[PDB]
Design a protein around this motif. Sequence first.
Motif, mmCIF file in Angstrom:
data_model
loop_
_atom_site.group_PDB
_atom_site.id
_atom_site.type_symbol
_atom_site.label_atom_id
_atom_site.label_comp_id
_atom_site.label_asym_id
_atom_site.label_seq_id
_atom_site.Cartn_x
_atom_site.Cartn_y
_atom_site.Cartn_z
ATOM 1 N N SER A 1 -8.117 -20.286 -7.125
ATOM 2 C CA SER A 1 -7.262 -21.448 -7.304
ATOM 3 C C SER A 1 -6.611 -21.406 -8.673
ATOM 4 N N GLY A 2 -5.302 -21.609 -8.707
ATOM 5 C CA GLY A 2 -4.582 -21.691 -9.960
ATOM 6 C C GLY A 2 -4.029 -20.346 -10.388
ATOM 7 N N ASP A 3 -4.418 -19.281 -9.697
ATOM 8 C CA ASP A 3 -3.847 -17.967 -10.004
ATOM 9 C C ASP A 3 -2.365 -17.901 -9.615
ATOM 10 N N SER A 4 -1.781 -16.705 -9.672
ATOM 11 C CA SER A 4 -0.352 -16.534 -9.425
ATOM 12 C C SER A 4 0.122 -16.892 -8.014
ATOM 13 N N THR A 5 -0.788 -16.937 -7.042
ATOM 14 C CA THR A 5 -0.370 -17.247 -5.676
ATOM 15 C C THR A 5 -0.096 -18.728 -5.540
ATOM 16 N N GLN A 6 -0.728 -19.516 -6.410
ATOM 17 C CA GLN A 6 -0.716 -20.972 -6.311
ATOM 18 C C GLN A 6 -1.225 -21.496 -4.951
ATOM 19 N N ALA A 7 -1.997 -20.680 -4.241
ATOM 20 C CA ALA A 7 -2.736 -21.166 -3.078
ATOM 21 C C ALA A 7 -4.070 -21.702 -3.569
ATOM 22 N N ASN A 8 -4.482 -22.851 -3.051
ATOM 23 C CA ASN A 8 -5.768 -23.417 -3.421
ATOM 24 C C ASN A 8 -6.898 -22.851 -2.567
ATOM 25 N N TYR A 9 -6.520 -22.169 -1.482
ATOM 26 C CA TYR A 9 -7.476 -21.628 -0.502
ATOM 27 C C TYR A 9 -7.188 -20.174 -0.142
ATOM 28 N N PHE A 10 -8.232 -19.441 0.237
ATOM 29 C CA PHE A 10 -8.089 -18.053 0.646
ATOM 30 C C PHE A 10 -9.037 -17.745 1.797
ATOM 31 N N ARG A 11 -8.588 -16.875 2.692
ATOM 32 C CA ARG A 11 -9.440 -16.360 3.758
ATOM 33 C C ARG A 11 -9.024 -14.935 4.089
ATOM 34 N N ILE A 12 -9.835 -14.270 4.907
ATOM 35 C CA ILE A 12 -9.498 -12.961 5.451
ATOM 36 C C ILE A 12 -9.338 -11.868 4.359
ATOM 37 N N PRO A 13 -10.392 -11.632 3.547
ATOM 38 C CA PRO A 13 -10.323 -10.587 2.518
ATOM 39 C C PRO A 13 -10.274 -9.188 3.118
ATOM 40 N N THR A 14 -9.587 -8.275 2.427
ATOM 41 C CA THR A 14 -9.658 -6.837 2.706
ATOM 42 C C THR A 14 -9.959 -6.056 1.426
ATOM 43 N N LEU A 15 -10.509 -4.850 1.590
ATOM 44 C CA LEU A 15 -10.726 -3.925 0.482
ATOM 45 C C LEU A 15 -10.486 -2.523 0.978
ATOM 46 N N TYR A 16 -9.848 -1.708 0.129
ATOM 47 C CA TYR A 16 -9.543 -0.318 0.461
ATOM 48 C C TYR A 16 -9.488 0.554 -0.806
ATOM 49 N N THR A 17 -10.175 1.692 -0.769
ATOM 50 C CA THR A 17 -10.238 2.583 -1.932
ATOM 51 C C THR A 17 -9.182 3.706 -1.844
ATOM 52 N N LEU A 18 -8.236 3.696 -2.776
ATOM 53 C CA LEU A 18 -7.121 4.631 -2.749
ATOM 54 C C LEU A 18 -7.480 5.965 -3.405
ATOM 55 N N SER A 19 -6.707 7.000 -3.104
ATOM 56 C CA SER A 19 -7.022 8.350 -3.596
ATOM 57 C C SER A 19 -7.036 8.482 -5.123
ATOM 58 N N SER A 20 -6.255 7.646 -5.812
ATOM 59 C CA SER A 20 -6.204 7.682 -7.269
ATOM 60 C C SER A 20 -7.468 7.076 -7.893
ATOM 61 N N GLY A 21 -8.271 6.406 -7.083
ATOM 62 C CA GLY A 21 -9.431 5.695 -7.591
ATOM 63 C C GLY A 21 -9.168 4.205 -7.762
ATOM 64 N N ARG A 22 -7.907 3.802 -7.646
ATOM 65 C CA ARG A 22 -7.570 2.385 -7.615
ATOM 66 C C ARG A 22 -8.164 1.768 -6.347
ATOM 67 N N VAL A 23 -8.770 0.593 -6.483
ATOM 68 C CA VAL A 23 -9.277 -0.145 -5.329
ATOM 69 C C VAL A 23 -8.322 -1.312 -5.087
ATOM 70 N N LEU A 24 -7.894 -1.475 -3.846
ATOM 71 C CA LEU A 24 -6.884 -2.461 -3.512
ATOM 72 C C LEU A 24 -7.458 -3.499 -2.560
ATOM 73 N N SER A 25 -7.030 -4.744 -2.742
ATOM 74 C CA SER A 25 -7.493 -5.842 -1.902
ATOM 75 C C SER A 25 -6.320 -6.675 -1.427
ATOM 76 N N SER A 26 -6.351 -7.091 -0.164
ATOM 77 C CA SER A 26 -5.391 -8.078 0.324
ATOM 78 C C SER A 26 -6.142 -9.273 0.895
#
Length: 658
Positions: free
Chosen positions: A197-222
């Motif tokens: 809450s209060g981050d850049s999305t300005q959504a007060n709520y979140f659901r449906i997390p994802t996580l994925y590990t990229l070849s560079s070693g960066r870990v990405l989430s949606s």
Amino acid sequence: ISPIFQGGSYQLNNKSIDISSLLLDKLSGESQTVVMKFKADKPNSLQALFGLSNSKAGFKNNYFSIFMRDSGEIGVEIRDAQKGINYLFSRPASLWGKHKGQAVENTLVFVSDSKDKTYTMYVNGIEVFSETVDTFLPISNINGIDKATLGAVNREGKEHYLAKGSIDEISLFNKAISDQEVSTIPLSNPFQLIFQSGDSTQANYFRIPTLYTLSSGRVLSSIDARYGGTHDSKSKINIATSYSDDNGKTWSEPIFAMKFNDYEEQLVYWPRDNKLKNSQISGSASFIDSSIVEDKKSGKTILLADVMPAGIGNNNANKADSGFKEINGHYYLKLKKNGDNDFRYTVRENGVVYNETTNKPTNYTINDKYEVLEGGKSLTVEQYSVDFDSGSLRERHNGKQVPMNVFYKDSLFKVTPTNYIAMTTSQNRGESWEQFKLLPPFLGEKHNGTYLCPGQGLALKSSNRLIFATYTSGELTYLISDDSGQTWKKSSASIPFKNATAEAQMVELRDGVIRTFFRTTTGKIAYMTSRDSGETWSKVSYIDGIQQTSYGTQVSAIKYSQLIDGKEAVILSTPNSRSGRKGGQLVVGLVNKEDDSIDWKYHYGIDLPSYGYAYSAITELPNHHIGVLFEKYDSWSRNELHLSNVVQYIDLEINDLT
Ligand SMILES: O=S(=O)(O)[C@]1(CNC2CCCCC2)C[C@@H](O)[C@@H](O)C1
Ligand SMILES: O=S(=O)(O)CCNCc1cccc(Cl)c1
């Protein structure tokens, strides 16, 4: 300010501790702050951590308490019979119990502020409620208070709400400390926030997390950035992403992968009362359920999500219509113009809006962003905002013009009110995202589209094949690409279910061999196997040893890179419960090389069996730790709607699980 009272290492073993003489004569003035660091890894059903009461005969309803439930709910009661006041404030799913098998030290901050007439509760750095009242009741102005108690409330000389736990630290202040002061209080959180809450999305709520590990070693989430409470579409929901370049220790400020602008991005405190809690933003377009995969060949990241035109969710989505018209093995998006009763238009090549009745092109085109142009000039619509100022939800024009989009309520040209799948891509590993494109229909012209399985897609190790699982009634529908997501084909695999929410996730057991685990309506997680790199699929089996509810929950799943007890291993994340979305587990399974069967050997409890756990994301971090981003609450319960900051992230190592 210094505390008027400070104490510590209290053990609450179903016997209250009296601190009356230490505390009661120190309380003064009408504003107070309680700071309490506490553990409860085996709580009773309902227990009070801290109490102030009139303990005398005939004054049983004159007390202040801070209580918790074994569900993880926290709250207070402020009661004075003479004043006719009985305040009860609380929020479900506010607590941690255990982490890596060790009792969590929760940090609780409760502010009672006479000047603003507001009671505010923080737990583990998260504001869980803030309530303003007409008639304020200072916690020590309760008629006849004569006891201060830890681990119970003394009513008429007896111990009520007996606690089991410990209070490592407790401080009281004769002041309502500022929100700024609260933020400087040290915490011992076992978890992190990626989205909040209060981050850049300005959504007060979140659901449906994802996580994925990229070849560079960066870990990405949606994730679903959900604005209109935690409701599935219809609502306003965007897809946001964040990445970590240090194995999950820190995360970037979110950006949107997919967003609409017909409604403002507003941070709104959605009503949680029984009259208004089903209020739903009803005129906004939205996205919902995202999934990620990385393509080796191109190096691109690819993200899909479901798309919904204004006012539409899976509930009221037009089945029996794909929203495309077939002309010569080609699919074109249908459109209906302002004033017509039918869809007289299609979007042909070069976004040319074409009139199907007279077979002439019009002067309108659709750009890349699905925005409408006339003679090359961009049309606009007025944006809506939402509020509860009137006492019910209002959706109204706010004065801002935004590009006119065919998914919008106010658009001159509107798409078919049904569900679509969109794809976007990133060439910089989640630093920016392209404008999305709709996938074509896969099951025919007069069939509505399938529903994306949220989480991860699968990039086969030994090839360029990309697979995203989707579901519809009676089958899983695998979307398959061998050309970096430029084109897709379906592979249908029937399942023994009509109208299941068959959310499916895949692991590659070995080259060419895919096992898919999925949600069902049987109370057991199902799986099927392809030895075909996804061309064909086995019949459906079920897993023993894990229970789900009749309605089921998304299950996430990975194939771990390292051996465990000398075996190849698969890790499942799911609630383990036949009652609700709680009892979160990681379940480690060892593969039998002879038949590819799996021995589910280790069950790791994420937190208490009674504490909430719903949709989840898991990925192996580059350092071989496991990252888990999950809904730490019951996202099915109608008692736990619209909670903030409950999707949380933890880091685990393999030895913790085993
Ligand atoms: O094997 S992949 O499918 O490419 C993937 C990543 N593998 C690395 C191998 C090296 C250690 C970290 C994980 C697993 C999926 O769960 C996604 O996180 C992508
Ligand atoms: O099991 S839950 O109810 O917590 C979530 C299920 N979401 C299914 C869905 C998918 C796409 C659009 C819509 Cl509108 C609803």
